[PDB]
Design a protein around this ligand. Structure first.
Ligand SMILES: *[C@@H]1O[C@H](CO)[C@@H](O[C@@H]2O[C@H](CO)[C@@H](O[C@@H]3O[C@H](CO[C@H]4O[C@H](CO)[C@@H](O)[C@H](O)[C@@H]4O)[C@@H](O)[C@H](O[C@H]4O[C@H](CO)[C@@H](O)[C@H](O)[C@@H]4O)[C@@H]3O)[C@H](O)[C@H]2NC(C)=O)[C@H](O)[C@H]1NC(C)=O
Ligand SMILES: *[C@@H]1O[C@H](CO)[C@@H](O[C@@H]2O[C@H](CO)[C@@H](O[C@@H]3O[C@H](CO[C@H]4O[C@H](CO)[C@@H](O)[C@H](O)[C@@H]4O)[C@@H](O)[C@H](O[C@H]4O[C@H](CO)[C@@H](O)[C@H](O)[C@@H]4O)[C@@H]3O)[C@H](O)[C@H]2NC(C)=O)[C@H](O)[C@H]1NC(C)=O
Ligand SMILES: *[C@@H]1O[C@H](CO)[C@@H](O[C@@H]2O[C@H](CO)[C@@H](O[C@@H]3O[C@H](CO[C@H]4O[C@H](CO)[C@@H](O)[C@H](O)[C@@H]4O)[C@@H](O)[C@H](O[C@H]4O[C@H](CO)[C@@H](O)[C@H](O)[C@@H]4O)[C@@H]3O)[C@H](O)[C@H]2NC(C)=O)[C@H](O)[C@H]1NC(C)=O
Ligand SMILES: *[C@@H]1O[C@H](CO)[C@@H](O[C@@H]2O[C@H](CO)[C@@H](O[C@@H]3O[C@H](CO[C@H]4O[C@H](CO)[C@@H](O)[C@H](O)[C@@H]4O)[C@@H](O)[C@H](O[C@H]4O[C@H](CO)[C@@H](O)[C@H](O)[C@@H]4O)[C@@H]3O)[C@H](O)[C@H]2NC(C)=O)[C@H](O)[C@H]1NC(C)=O
Lengths: 336, 113, 333, 336, 333, 333
């Protein structure tokens, strides 16, 4: 056991952790890969998503060459603070966590030729800008961009360990999405520029498509039922004024409850979404039914035949128009 | 941009423009042979006043937001109050209250004996 | 004579190398784990997780810490844990964890003459438990805690439950307000990642949801409003306003009940059992209102034929509702 | 001043903070007391409570004897980290805080005979399991247990500084309770056995009684008013059928809304509370009133005398039964 | 010369025992406090506290830090504060406090040739403030900040305000959308605990709650609904449905006025002023509905009595409501 | 030859004092600031603040850190920042800020041969911004970020924008849900406190709220409903059912608009213009309803009086509504 202690002391003898490997001689090449243990929930209100990853980096450092009975040293994570490690950060991250229970979730492994494997476990909250013009039938491409913070492309370059499509691996059990479906991911790399120089960025896009069943059984069906219920009033006699008044009032209140319940889901955007259009048209139908009832009641005594004709025409016009609107709306948004 | 107009015992300072970005009004007086001296200050909205020790219980300051005006009333005047007056506006993060440097927009110089 | 003990402990830590595990470069070090569950806190369907507080004990042997001449088990200050090697045990499916630190860090180090080390912590951790709510509120969940080494493969370390099935204690004393712990289970296995194979210990609970609260405040309002819709069959058909108002208000308050129910759970895309029951009750009350409207529409031409169906409304609707209720309860129970 | 520096240096020369006083010789005795500065809010939703305390411990250490110009060294709390202190922890704590503003709120005092007094300011959140059978007329005994974490009963024992009744002192102006009354507390000490051995535990029970004013003016009054409003309908003449129907519909709807909404206060508990029984009886009364109206309307055309008799009997029967039920309920639950 | 100053500071810190307060074993050290209030971020009635951000300055004298030969006041990097002695000042009624640390820790240390030390911090503290809401929304609160020494009694330390009533500045920077600062007061005293007597300072604010929001949101809608409920007395009693619907609508709407603002208040057991006004208006509308019910009951037998009752109600109801408003606004204002 | 670089760096830090600013006792050290705005997350009217993420770079010169023979920009590990003097820059109007620390602390140290130091951080800060909501939703806000030295005065440290108006970048790429950034402005000045004068930098944005959706959502429906309320004046009083229907429809629409506005508006308890406009419209429809009630009560005995009052209302309601709209436009637009 003392042999390995002497080897480690020799390795750390005169080693400077403030200088990157090949400082002024070559370019440090860090090969990275990601194992997504669980793609966490997506927050529409905050426009952010959570992800839990095993983040692995590997690079060559010849100052740590050694020869001994073993070829690979799997050392304690605190040793990672005694040597130089890349300062990778996530460009679009918001508030990330490096788990520290029960010990710092890090592993360091050194091969006899100097190769270092450094792995950590992270939870990242990343920004996912969203265009909600097709809510709740929209698709998104949430990005995850990372790279060095202090070293430019002339000093540290990043690469994927294997083919880019296979360097980001999603675990089968890792799906905490209650509302979206993870179609796939796209892996790319590029160069970014800023006032401090040019840096290398590794990017991974996750493609998500929202599931519509919840809004179908939560907003669309109650609204359709309320509209049909309001249209039911046209079959009653013209004399029953209190009946149709109760019809209108109760339908309006139910629509108000449904609209209040549905609107809180979205963030406070300034444009109009598909759900807003549907709610507005349902409100228009209910209010038009109420106004038609008032107009029919107006012509009750002076021209009863005209009132009967208007009611008879409405009995056909309202359901037909609502069906046409539903067909147009669905054939428009579903195909888009 | 804030414009300050002085009228007037009693003096009135009327402010026009972006008076919300400068929620504090202050009064200063300059002696013929000395530097500017703080007199009083009043929040535009909170209605809280601060006075110098030399003019406590003798001067009063109030404000009304109906027409964006602040009143400084002088009582029990003394001959040693011969200085040119100024009404100034102070930003929300301009620092101390007793220092003329922190005040941006200055009103008309008024001479009162 | 505490000077002798101080000398012994200083000798133990003299040449100790924290960077190397016990038996570094040799056979793996065995670690035996015990858990004493203090309490299981809020089991949240919205967040799909559960909070768990536990005394977590690890047992291993380090021949570098063997001492002689002291016939005692040295219970040392918890800070001495910062100078010894401890396993890098972590919880794979945890979201937010902490070790309690009042008045000091809730940590225990106990050393034995044969070099054995007992290392204890008090941990409150939130752990993710994805739930299948397709039978809510008559569901049965299975929530697990996963324990794993991070940097050491199966060639460097191996876990086991110390004491067999008795390694976890305090489960029977847990009082979950909404669930009842039917069973708990201990599993030991290996998990292969791209960096090698690691030991794994799984502690699983099977939680069965209670039904008294939901029968109280969920199904009973719907059944009562269905009976209220049935009431309309007795009011005389000439009273158009009365029956119209009754049917309309029953239908719309049924929809309101559905909306109120569906906002205490995550926005899952599927349909829970309670949603199907509420939909069935809504369909029944809507059919009753539609039948009343149809009778009122043709009561002028054939008053006898229209009034005949009122008795059938008074009879069949409770019968059909009872049949549907029996089918639903038999299918889900 | 230099004399005190020399004394402090001599005390810590060879002192080992990994070993409890009298290790291997006798049992370290710790005398504890608590000054509750403010008994914080009680959150029956999470079944917990908060409490701010001055926690004082006193013990004897032979290694810290000295003789000098002063009898008591009132040292800075920094010294408290360079000696041995008990590892006291709260068994039922959830997440406590040791305050650090503007400095670590701790005090350490060393007497010339080796007696140490160590005091710290803490904010303890503790579990208080509750039985809500009699809600909102329930009484609780919230516990607070503490003891050593690593040292068993054969190494460290705990005692109260004075008589146990007077060893926990609550400040007079230290009540942050909103809907509870702090009647008093009881103090006890016992032995708890765990898989690591036997330990000494000190327990304090705080007795709380809920204040019923909020639920009186929030839940009971609307229910009573709804029941009275429903029973008002028995006095309208039978020529006004829509009015009575509106009465019944609105009262039933309001009772349903109250029943649904009032269950969103307490945490989900699978048993009925007193408020649930009150709501259920009010709902039964309203539904019975509507059924009575329907029955009267059934006999209006065929047997007017029978319907008139039913209305006349109901006008007396309903208020009398409601008053009797209220008397029984309040007598039962105000003397439980 | 930088080297000369560095060696002077090194000589000052050589042999400096941080564990001992200035004048240890002798007369107490006098510490003067200054506070510059940046803002009061929020005042929460639900949590019963308030958030306050301030510059906290402490002034004392330590003869061990006296230096000669430099006619300058040394403004040192804040990290040197970790090597000096600072008072253990704490706030008794704070629940969560922190010192801002971007970009560095917001801390300041300044030394003078005399040995005087000035120590400054930027602190955000959430201080508890118990409230008496019996006159809400016409209430008036008094929130305090208590400053005390933890480990040092009045024999070891003394507290005083530096500048008397001018010790606290920046009160005019306080801008609460719902309150308004009326007065601030400074108190100095001694507090006796079982361990001894400690110096105590107190900074107290008096807050007056703005009324216009409640007038626009609560009182005016209640008055409008009460007035609308009086239209029933001007309707012929033959229209039973109209009057009953109007009465029911007024009652239900009155029961649901301050729901939006009553979910941001604690579950207090007493009756606030706004609750009393709402209950009075509810009593008025309920009595109007009862009056119509009585008129309908006696409508057929004696129509003249019903007409007289309606005519008298038309005068009695507005007059009694005006008297109620007069008494209420006289008592609470 | 990393040995030569290691020797040079060790020589630079040997004897270096972190308690002394560059040119201690001499001319002030000038610090240049660059800010790159990554994103502005959210602007909150409830909390009167906004969240902003940025890359914050400081540029200065230290003659102690001058090295020769190495023709490179020495980019060092970020931990070297703990062994150097850095400015004590802080944000005056912040409430909670932090420096990102994944995977390491987000910090950059770059030395240059002439001794120039570049020091970069990545900071997410919540900053206070008081808002004037009187003219809501036509309000235009002005949110600032204030940068100041905490300990050193203008005699020791000076601030300036590096590159002038090009110092701050990335504002044009910012997209906000409610607001649109119109113009940003950079200011440099001095601020005098009781302890002396400090340098100050200000970065201010002027935000204009998006107005189309609010106008199409709360103003137009209110105006249309108030216009529709006057149709009942032209309706003859013989068909009272139509007028009752119109009144009920107008009241229902007003309540719906009010509830939706309550849902849209932030829950800040103080007056806004839109609330007063909606209250005025509701008062108008309430007055129309009361006028109809008066007509209904009078028309039976005095048809001429009812006809006359309806005819006069036909002209005096639009005139009064136009006068109210003119007053609202002058007072708040
Ligand atoms: C919640 O849901 C989880 C799954 O998501 C359940 O966990 C499973 O529990 C079962 C037991 O109920 C586990 O099955 C057992 O696995 C053991 C480990 O097998 C591994 O290691 C052995 C070598 O030791 C390999 O040969 C094997 O291929 C695996 O790699 C086995 O040792 C057990 O063997 C038992 O059954 C076999 C027959 O199948 C007998 O021959 C044996 O004698 C013995 O009786 C057994 O197979 C399963 O692995 C768990 N899976 C996971 C993912 O954890 C939880 O049980 C559930 N919650 C509750 C409360 O039940
Ligand atoms: C009251 O209690 C709180 C904790 O509840 C204390 O806050 C801690 O204060 C300590 C001492 O300053 C901090 O420890 C130091 O952390 C530095 C890094 O901090 C950053 O990164 C951490 C995460 O790693 C963040 O949590 C933090 O906010 C910062 O972003 C280290 O660089 C320091 O190391 C230095 O000292 C060690 C000593 O061994 C050397 O080895 C190093 O080389 C280096 O010189 C140090 O570890 C701790 O991070 C703080 N925690 C929190 C949560 O804030 C308060 O300080 C305490 N009050 C008082 C008055 O002490
Ligand atoms: C919010 O509410 C708090 C109380 O909860 C108010 O605080 C009180 O403020 C008053 C002053 O307005 C304080 O009263 C003063 O106390 C001083 C200290 O008394 C201590 O020390 C003296 C010896 O020096 C002892 O005798 C005494 O017992 C105490 O131990 C006194 O020095 C003051 O004396 C002044 O009045 C007396 C007459 O009463 C004169 O004889 C004196 O000359 C002198 O003028 C005075 O008594 C009171 O102590 C405060 N209470 C607390 C708990 O701190 C806040 O003022 C309020 N907020 C607002 C805005 O008003
Ligand atoms: C949000 O609201 C804030 C206020 O709360 C606005 O900030 C103000 O912005 C204006 C510019 O638009 C600032 O005015 C400028 O101040 C500069 C600094 O003055 C200091 O230094 C000079 C000496 O250099 C001293 O004389 C002076 O007393 C100060 O100590 C001046 O240098 C500028 O002068 C330029 O313009 C003037 C005319 O205005 C010319 O006469 C000059 O020659 C020169 O061209 C100028 O006066 C003002 O100081 C800012 N106030 C605060 C408190 O920061 C924001 O602009 C606003 N947001 C937006 C988007 O507009």
């Amino acid at each position: 056991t003392t042999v390995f202690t002497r080897i480690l002391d020799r390795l750390l003898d005169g080693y400077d952790n403030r200088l990157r490997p090949g400082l002024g001689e070559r370019v440090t090449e860090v090969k990275t890969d990601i194992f997504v243990t669980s793609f966490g929930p997506v927050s529409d209100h905050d426009m952010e998503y959570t992800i839990d990853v095993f983040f692995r980096q590997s690079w060559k450092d010849e100052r740590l060459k050694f020869k001994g009975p073993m070829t690979v040293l799997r050392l304690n994570n605190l040793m990672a603070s005694k040597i130089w490690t890349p300062d990778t950060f996530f460009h679009n991250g918001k508030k990330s966590v490096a788990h520290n229970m029960t010990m710092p979730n890090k592993l360091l492994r050194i091969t006899e030729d100097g190769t270092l494997l450094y792995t950590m476990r992270l939870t990242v909250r990343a920004e996912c800008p969203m265009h909600l013009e097709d809510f709740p039938m929209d698709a998104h491409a949430c990005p995850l961009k990372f790279g060095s913070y202090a070293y430019t492309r002339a000093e540290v370059v990043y690469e994927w360990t294997r083919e880019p499509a296979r360097s980001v691996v999603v675990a089968e059990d890792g799906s905490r999405l209650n509302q979206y479906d993870l179609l796939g991911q796209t892996v790319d790399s590029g160069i970014v520029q800023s006032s401090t120089g040019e840096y290398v960025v590794m990017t991974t896009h996750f493609h998500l498509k929202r599931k519509i069943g919840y809004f179908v059984i939560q907003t669309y069906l109650p609204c359709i039922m309320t509209v049909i219920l309001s249209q039911v009033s046209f079959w009653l006699n013209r004399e029953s004024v209190p009946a149709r008044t109760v019809f209108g009032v109760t339908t309006v209140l139910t629509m108000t409850t449904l609209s209040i319940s549905a609107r809180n889901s979205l963030p406070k955007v300034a444009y109009a979404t598909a759900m807003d259009w549907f709610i507005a048209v349902c409100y228009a139908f209910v209010f038009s039914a109420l106004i038609e009832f008032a107009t029919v009641n107006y012509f009750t005594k002076s021209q009863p035949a005209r009132a009967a004709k208007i009611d008879r025409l409405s009995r056909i016009a309202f359901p037909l128009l609502f069906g046409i609107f539903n067909l147009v709306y669905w054939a428009t948004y579903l195909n888009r | 941009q804030v414009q300050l107009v002085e009228s007037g015992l009693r003096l009135s300072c009327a402010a026009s423009g972006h008076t919300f970005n400068y929620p504090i009004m202050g009064w200063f007086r300059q002696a013929p042979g000395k530097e500017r001296e703080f007199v009083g200050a009043i929040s535009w909205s909170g209605g809280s006043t601060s006075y110098a020790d030399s003019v406590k219980d003798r001067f009063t300051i109030s404000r009304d937001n109906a027409k964006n005006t602040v009143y400084l009333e002088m009582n029990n005047l003394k001959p040693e109050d011969t200085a040119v007056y100024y009404c100034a506006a102070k930003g929300r993060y301009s620092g101390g209250l007793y220092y003329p440097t922190n005040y941006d927009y200055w009103g008309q110089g008024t001479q009162v004996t | 004579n505490m000077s002798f003990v101080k000398e012994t402990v200083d000798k133990l830590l003299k040449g100790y190398d924290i960077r190397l595990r016990p038996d570094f470069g040799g056979p793996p070090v065995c670690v035996g784990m015990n858990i004493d569950i203090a309490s299981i806190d809020m089991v949240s369907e919205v967040n799909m997780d559960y909070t768990l507080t536990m005394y977590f004990q690890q047992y291993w042997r380090d021949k570098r810490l063997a001492y002689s001449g002291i016939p005692l088990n040295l219970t040392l200050d918890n800070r001495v844990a910062d100078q010894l090697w401890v396993p890098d045990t972590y919880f794979l499916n945890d979201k937010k964890s902490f070790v309690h630190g009042v008045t000091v860090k809730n940590r225990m180090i106990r050393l034995h003459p044969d070099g054995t080390v007992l290392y204890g912590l008090r941990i409150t951790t939130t752990a993710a438990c994805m739930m299948d709510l397709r039978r809510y509120p008559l569901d049965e969940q299975n929530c697990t805690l996963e324990i794993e080494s991070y940097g050491y493969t199966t060639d460097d370390i191996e876990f086991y439950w110390r004491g067999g099935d008795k390694a976890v204690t305090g489960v029977e004393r847990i009082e979950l307000p909404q669930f009842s712990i039917v069973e708990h289970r201990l599993v030991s296995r290996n998990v292969v990642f791209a960096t090698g194979a690691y030991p794994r210990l799984s502690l699983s609970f099977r939680l069965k949801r209670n039904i008294g609260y939901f029968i109280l405040q969920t199904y009973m309002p719907s059944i009562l409003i269905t009976i209220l819709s049935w009431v309309s069959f007795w009011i005389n058909y000439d009273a158009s306003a009365a029956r119209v108002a009754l049917g309309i208000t029953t239908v719309l308050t049924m929809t309101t009940i559905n909306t109120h129910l569906r906002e205490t759970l995550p926005k899952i895309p599927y349909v829970k059992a309670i949603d199907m029951y509420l939909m069935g009750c809504f369909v029944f009350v809507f059919l009753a209102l539609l039948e009343y409207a149809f009778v009122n529409y043709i009561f002028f031409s054939q008053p006898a034929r229209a009034a005949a169906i009122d008795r059938w409304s008074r009879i069949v609707f409770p019968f059909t509702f009872s049949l549907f209720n029996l089918v639903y309860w038999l299918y889900y129970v």
